[PDB]
């Protein structure tokens, strides 16, 4: 399941976008629209293990977050993204899952959607492709998070 949860200034998901078709059944049962980030994200994790996409013994959930400037003030989003990161891992602790959080950029966000990937899948795709791990966009469409992360572990060659 590749999901994009678009939140507003009050951390609630205004709209949820499936970047991959397997996310659609998850979002259906989750219903994260009009839901605060904590419960919404918890639903995505909860519903995915119930549908058998992940098992609780090995579930690395990837979280990537970018602040697409609809709020900024002057120095808000710097510490604001930290409020995001702390919630992403807190929900991962809630669900009892393992996590990898790679913060995304707005530039990265539009690259992700152009590759037909979620920012999570893409953030680690772009990591792996730099590491010398040969990933195709089709491999990124298909291979699991645990497969992509596992390849970084045994073959790490770049920053």
């Amino acid at each position: 399941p590749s999901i994009g949860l678009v939140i507003d200034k009050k951390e609630k998901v205004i709209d949820a976008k499936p970047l991959n078709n397997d996310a659609k059944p998850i979002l259906d049962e989750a219903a994260p629209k009009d839901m605060p980030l904590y419960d919404a994200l918890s639903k995505i994790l909860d519903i995915s293990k119930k549908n058998g996409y992940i098992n609780s013994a090995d579930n690395i959930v990837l979280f990537s977050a970018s602040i697409n400037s609809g709020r900024n003030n002057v120095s808000e989003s710097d510490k604001g993204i930290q409020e995001i990161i702390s919630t992403l891992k807190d929900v991962a602790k809630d669900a009892g899952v393992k996590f990898e959080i790679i913060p995304s950029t707005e530039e990265d966000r539009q690259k992700a959607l152009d590759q037909n990937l979620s920012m999570g899948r893409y953030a680690i795709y772009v990591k792996a492709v730099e590491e010398g791990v040969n990933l195709n966009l089709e491999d990124a469409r298909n291979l699991s998070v645990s497969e992509i992360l596992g390849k970084l572990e045994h073959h790490h060659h770049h920053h």
């Binding site: 994009g4 951390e11 995505i44």
Partner: peptide, 10 residues
């Protein structure tokens, strides 16, 4: 709109 959280499972 503020942030996009893209979550990858499986």
């Amino acid at each position: 709109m503020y942030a996009y959280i893209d979550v990858d499972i499986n």
